[PDB]
């Protein structure tokens, strides 16, 4: 998915925040990895 650059932290397990609370929550015992990379150039439009 695509998220605001400041919300990446919220993706950690057992953490609060709007995204982790009402959009996508990882289990407290999550086992795996998280990949996040800047997509400004490919997802940012002059008109928004």
């Amino acid at each position: 998915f695509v998220i605001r650059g400041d919300e990446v932290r919220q993706i950690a397990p057992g953490q609060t925040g709007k995204i982790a609370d009402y959009n996508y929550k990882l289990p407290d015992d999550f086992t795996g990895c998280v990949i996040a990379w800047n997509s400004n150039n490919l997802d940012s439009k002059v008109g928004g």
Binding site: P13, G14, Q15, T16, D28
Partner: protein, 49 residues
Amino acid sequence: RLDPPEAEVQIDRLITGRLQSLQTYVTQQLIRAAEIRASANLAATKMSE
């Protein structure tokens, strides 16, 4: 007062403390029971003899 993700640590601390208390109590009871059983064997011998 705490979100479960961090409250689990406090719960674990309390569980460890109470479990240690129970183990100490049971060990004391075992030793006391051994002593009382020795006394009871002596009392039975005294009764018989």
